[PDB]
Amino acid sequence: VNPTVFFDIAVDGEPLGRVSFELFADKVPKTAENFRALSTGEKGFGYKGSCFHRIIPGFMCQGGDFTRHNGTGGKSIYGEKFEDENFILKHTGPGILSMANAGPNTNGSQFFICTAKTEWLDGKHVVFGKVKEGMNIVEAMERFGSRNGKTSKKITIADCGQL
Amino acid sequence: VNPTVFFDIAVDGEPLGRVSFELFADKVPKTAENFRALSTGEKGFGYKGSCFHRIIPGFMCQGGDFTRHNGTGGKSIYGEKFEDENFILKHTGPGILSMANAGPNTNGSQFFICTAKTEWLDGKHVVFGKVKEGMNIVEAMERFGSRNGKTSKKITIADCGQL
Amino acid sequence: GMTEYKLVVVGADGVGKSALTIQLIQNHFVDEYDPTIEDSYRKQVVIDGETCLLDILDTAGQEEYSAMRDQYMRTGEGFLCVFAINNTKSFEDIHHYREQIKRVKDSEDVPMVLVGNKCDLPSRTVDTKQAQDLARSYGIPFIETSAKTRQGVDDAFYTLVREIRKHK
Amino acid sequence: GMTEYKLVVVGADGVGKSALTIQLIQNHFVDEYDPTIEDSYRKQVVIDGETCLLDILDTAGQEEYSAMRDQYMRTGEGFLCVFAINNTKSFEDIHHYREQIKRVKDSEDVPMVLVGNKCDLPSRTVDTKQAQDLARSYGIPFIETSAKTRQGVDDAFYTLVREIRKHKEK
Numbered sequence: 001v002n003p004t005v006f007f008d009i010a011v012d013g014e015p016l017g018r019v020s021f022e023l024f025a026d027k028v029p030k031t032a033e034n035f036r037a038l039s040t041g042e043k044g045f046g047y048k049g050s051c052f053h054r055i056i057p058g059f060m061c062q063g064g065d066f067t068r069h070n071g072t073g074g075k076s077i078y079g080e081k082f083e084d085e086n087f088i089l090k091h092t093g094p095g096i097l098s099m100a101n102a103g104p105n106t107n108g109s110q111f112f113i114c115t116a117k118t119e120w121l122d123g124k125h126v127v128f129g130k131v132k133e134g135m136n137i138v139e140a141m142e143r144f145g146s147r148n149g150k151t152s153k154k155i156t157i158a159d160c161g162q163l
Numbered sequence: 164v165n166p167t168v169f170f171d172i173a174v175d176g177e178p179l180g181r182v183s184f185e186l187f188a189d190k191v192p193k194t195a196e197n198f199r200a201l202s203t204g205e206k207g208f209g210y211k212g213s214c215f216h217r218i219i220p221g222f223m224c225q226g227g228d229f230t231r232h233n234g235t236g237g238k239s240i241y242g243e244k245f246e247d248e249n250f251i252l253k254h255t256g257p258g259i260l261s262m263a264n265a266g267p268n269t270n271g272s273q274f275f276i277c278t279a280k281t282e283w284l285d286g287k288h289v290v291f292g293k294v295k296e297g298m299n300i301v302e303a304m305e306r307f308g309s310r311n312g313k314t315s316k317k318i319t320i321a322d323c324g325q326l
Numbered sequence: 327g328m329t330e331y332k333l334v335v336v337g338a339d340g341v342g343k344s345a346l347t348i349q350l351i352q353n354h355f356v357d358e359y360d361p362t363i364e365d366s367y368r369k370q371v372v373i374d375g376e377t378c379l380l381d382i383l384d385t386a387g388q389e390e391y392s393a394m395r396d397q398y399m400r401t402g403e404g405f406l407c408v409f410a411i412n413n414t415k416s417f418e419d420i421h422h423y424r425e426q427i428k429r430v431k432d433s434e435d436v437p438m439v440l441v442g443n444k445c446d447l448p449s450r451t452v453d454t455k456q457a458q459d460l461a462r463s464y465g466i467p468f469i470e471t472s473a474k475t476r477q478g479v480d481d482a483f484y485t486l487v488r489e490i491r492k493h494k
Numbered sequence: 495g496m497t498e499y500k501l502v503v504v505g506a507d508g509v510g511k512s513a514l515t516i517q518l519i520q521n522h523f524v525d526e527y528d529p530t531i532e533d534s535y536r537k538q539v540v541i542d543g544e545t546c547l548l549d550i551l552d553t554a555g556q557e558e559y560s561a562m563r564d565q566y567m568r569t570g571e572g573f574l575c576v577f578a579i580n581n582t583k584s585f586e587d588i589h590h591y592r593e594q595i596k597r598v599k600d601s602e603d604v605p606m607v608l609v610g611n612k613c614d615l616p617s618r619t620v621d622t623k624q625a626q627d628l629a630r631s632y633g634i635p636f637i638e639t640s641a642k643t644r645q646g647v648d649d650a651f652y653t654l655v656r657e658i659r660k661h662k663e664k
C-alpha cells in the first residue's frame with residue numbers, strides 16, 4: 001500500500017502542526033521512494049531541519065533544500081538528480097505534492113505543495129503525492145510568504161518520518 | 164571637547180570594518196554624552212551586540228535598539244526618552260549622525276547615519292555627530308539594504324567604545 | 327486563475343493600520359509600535375463564494391511624504407481609511423486622506439472604507455455617532471475594529487473588496 | 495534629491511541577469527543557480543560626477559510567463575538586454591525581448607543596452623562582431639561582461655543610465 005509520511009512544521013522554532021502525505025508509489029514508485037527515504041533520513045541525510053524557502057500565497061509552498069539551505073540545493077537518494085519518472089498525475093488542486101526542478105530530468109529533493117490548482121505545471125513537474133492530513137497547516141504557512149516567495153519567518157521541518 | 168567613538172561592524176558575524184564618529188558635544192552636549200556612554204557600555208547597557216535594523220540605500224542606515232532588538236525599542240541614559248536638545252546642526256550630507264524619534268522629545272538610543280543629504284529631516288531630528296573614519300564601511304552596509312529598509316544579512320555592532 | 331485585488335491602508339501614524347493588516351494576514355497582534363515605511367502582503371480568501379488574491383499595501387501616515395503617497399494612490403483599487411477612536415486628530419486627518427485620494431485618482435467615487443480602530447479601549451474621544459455621521463456623508467461603510475481583540479478586521483477588508491467589486 | 499533610474503534586467507534563463515545584478519549590488523559572484531522569481535534592489539552610484547539612485551528589477555526569463563512581462567516593462571525606464579556569449583539561443587531570444595519591450599512601450603525609442611555576458615568563458619558561440627552589428631542595427635550600445643570577473647559590470651549599468659538621461663534630454 002502507498003506509504004504515508006509526516007512533517008512536523010515549526011515557525012521560528014515554535015510548533016505549528018503536523019502535515020501528512022500519501023505518496024503515490026503505485027503510479028510513481030521511484031519518485032515516491034525518494035521522498036519517503038528523505039523523510040526518514042535513513043540514508044544519512046534528508047528533510048529533517050530544512051526549511052520551506054519559498055512560499056507564494058495563492059500558489060504553493062516549496063522546500064526540500066537540505067544541502068545548501070538556500071533554495072539552490074538538495075539531492076536525491078539516486079544521485080544529485082534523477083530523471084522525470086512520468087507525468088501521469090496532474091496538479092489538480094490544493095494539497096498536490098510535486099517535484100521541483102530546473103528543467104527536464106533534474107529532480108533532486110526540492111518539492112512543492114500546491115495551495116491552488118496549477119495546471120500549467122502539468123507535464124513539467126512530476127506529481128507524486130497529496131496532503132492527507134493537516135492541509136490547514138499548509139494554509140497557515142502562506143501567512144509567512146510573499147509575492148516573490150521570500151518568507152518573513154523561518155519555516156522548518158522540525159521533525160519528519162514515516163507513519 | 165568633542166569625543167570620538169567607534170563601532171566595529173559585522174555582517175552575519177563576519178567583521179566588516181570600523182566606523183568612527185565625532186560627537187558634537189560642543190553644540191548638543193546631552194545628546195553627545197548619551198551616545199558616548201551607550202557606545203562604551205559604561206552604564207551597564209548600550210550598543211554592543213545590537214543591530215542595524217533599517218538600511219535604505221541612498222538615504223540612511225538606522226540602528227540602536229538594544230532593549231528589544233526589533234526596531235521599536237531603545238532607551239537613553241536619562242530614562243526612556245529625552246527632549247530634543249536643539250536643531251542647530253542639519254542633515255547636510257553623507258556621514259551625518261542623528262537621532263531617530265517617534266515625535267518631538269522622544270529621543271532614546273536609536274540613531275541613523277545619513278548616506279546622502281536628507282534636508283527634510285532638518286528641524287525634526289537632532290543632529291549630533293558625523294562619521295570621522297570608515298564612511299566606506301557605511302557605504303558597504305548599503306549592500307545589504309532595500310527600498311523599505313529590511314536588511315538581507317544581519318548587520319551588527321560587534322564591538323564599540325570610545326577612542 | 328483567481329482574481330487579484332489591490333487594497334491600500336491609510337491613516338495617521340499609530341491608529342493601527344499595520345496592527346489591523348497583520349491581524350488580517352497573520353492572526354497575530356502587534357502590541358509594540360513599529361511605524362511603517364512601506365509593506366506589501368498577499369493573502370488568498372473566499373469572499374461571497376469566489377476565491378481571490380488580496381494584494382495589500384500598508385503605508386505610512388507621515389505628513390512629510392504626502393507628495394509620494396500619490397503613487398500608492400494611483401495603483402490601488404480601494405482604500406481602508408483608519409483612525410483611532412481615542413485619537414481625535416487621526417479622525418480629523420481622515421478628511422485629508424480622503425480629499426487627496428479623490429484628487430490623485432480624479433473622481434468623487436473611489437472604493438473606500440472608514441475604520442474606527444481600537445474600539446477595545448475604555449477611553450474614547452470620537453463617538454461612534456461622529457464616525458457614523460461622517461461615513462454617511464461620504465457614501466461609504468463604517469466599521470469599528472480592534473486589532474487587539476481581532477474585532478471587525480475581516481469585515482473591514484472584505485467589505486472593501488465588496489466595495490471594489492460593486493464599483494467594478 | 496538624487497534622481498532615481500528604473501533599470502530592468504531581462505533575457506533568457508541562465509544568461510547571468512542575477513549574477514550581473516548581485517555583482518553590481520554586493521560585489522561578489524553567485525556561483526550557484528537560483529532561478530529568479532522577481533527581485534528588486536537599490537544602489538546609489540556616481541555616474542559622470544552625478545550621484546543617482548539605481549532601482550534594479552531582476553526578472554524571470556521563464557518562457558511560460560512571457561505574457562506577464564508587460565507590467566514591469568510598462569514601469570521600467572531602461573532595459574539591460576542580456577544574452578550569454580556561449581548560448582546562441584539566448585542571443586536569438588534577444589529579438590523577442592526587444593520587440594516585446596517596444597510593443598509594450600508602444601515606442602521605437604526605448605533606452606536599452608545589449609549585454610553579452612560570460613565573456614570569461616572559452617567556449618564562445620556568439621561573435622563580438624555579430625553582437626556589435628545587431629546592437630548597431632538597433633541603435634543601442636553593446637557591452638561584453640563577465641559577472642565572474644566583474645569585467646564590464648559597472649559599464650553596462652552606467653551606460654544604461656546614460657541612455658536614460660539622453661532619452662529624457664537632460
Ligand SMILES: CCn1c(-c2cc(N3CCN(C4CC4)CC3)cnc2[C@H](C)OC)c2c3cc(ccc31)-c1csc(n1)C[C@H](NC(=O)[C@H]1[C@@H]3COC[C@@H]31)C(=O)N1CCC[C@H](N1)C(=O)OCC(C)(C)C2
Nearest residue numbers: 059072100101102112147327527529530531532554559562
Ligand atoms: C512571472 C512571475 N512568476 C510566477 C507567477 C505566475 C502567475 N500566473 C501564472 C499562471 N496563470 C494562470 C493560468 C492563468 C496566472 C498568472 C502569477 N504570479 C506569479 C508571481 C507571484 O509573480 C511574481 C511564477 C513564477 C515562477 C518562476 C519565475 C517567475 C514566476 C520560476 C523560477 S524557477 C521556477 N519557476 C521553477 C522552480 N525551480 C526551482 O526552484 C529550482 C531551483 C534550482 O534548482 C532547484 C530549484 C520550481 O521547480 N518550482 C515548483 C513549482 C512552482 C515554481 N517553483 C514557482 O515558484 O512558481 C511560482 C508561481 C507563482 C507558481 C509561478
Ligand SMILES: CCn1c(-c2cc(N3CCN(C4CC4)CC3)cnc2[C@H](C)OC)c2c3cc(ccc31)-c1csc(n1)C[C@H](NC(=O)[C@H]1[C@@H]3COC[C@@H]31)C(=O)N1CCC[C@H](N1)C(=O)OCC(C)(C)C2
Nearest residue numbers: 219222235263264265275310361362363364386391394495
Ligand atoms: C514615502 C516612503 N518613505 C520615504 C521615502 C522618501 C523619498 N523622498 C523624500 C524626499 N524628497 C526630497 C525633497 C526631494 C525625495 C523623495 C524617497 N523614497 C522613500 C522610500 C525609500 O520609499 C519607500 C521615507 C520614509 C520614512 C518613513 C515612512 C515612509 C517613508 C518613516 C517612518 S518612521 C520614520 N520615518 C522616523 C523614524 N522613527 C522610528 O524609526 C521609530 C521607532 C519606534 O520608536 C523608536 C523608533 C526615524 O527616526 N528615522 C530616522 C530618520 C530617517 C527615518 N527613520 C527613515 O527611515 O526615513 C526613510 C527615508 C527613505 C529617508 C524617507
Ligand SMILES: Nc1nc2c(ncn2[C@@H]2O[C@H](COP(=O)(O)OP(=O)(O)NP(=O)(O)O)[C@@H](O)[C@H]2O)c(=O)[nH]1
Nearest residue numbers: 339340341342343344345356357361362444473474
Ligand atoms: N489597545 C489597542 N491597541 C492597539 C490596537 N491596534 C493597535 N494597537 C497598538 O497601537 C499602536 C500602534 O499600532 P500600529 O499598528 O503600529 O499603528 P500604525 O497605524 O500602523 N502606525 P504607522 O502609520 O506609523 O505605520 C501599537 O502599540 C499597537 O499595538 C487596538 O485595537 N487596541
Ligand SMILES: Nc1nc2c(ncn2[C@@H]2O[C@H](COP(=O)(O)OP(=O)(O)NP(=O)(O)O)[C@@H](O)[C@H]2O)c(=O)[nH]1
Nearest residue numbers: 507508509510511512513529530555612640641642
Ligand atoms: N562563468 C560565468 N558564469 C556565469 C556568469 N554569469 C552567470 N554565471 C552562471 O550562470 C548560471 C546562471 O546565472 P544567473 O545569474 O542565475 O542567471 P539568470 O539569467 O539570472 N537566470 P534566471 O532567468 O533563471 O533568473 C549560474 O551558475 C551563474 O553562476 C558569468 O559571467 N560567467
Ligand SMILES: [Mg+2]
Nearest residue numbers: 343344361362
Ligand atoms: Mg504601521
Ligand SMILES: [Mg+2]
Nearest residue numbers: 511512529530
Ligand atoms: Mg536570475
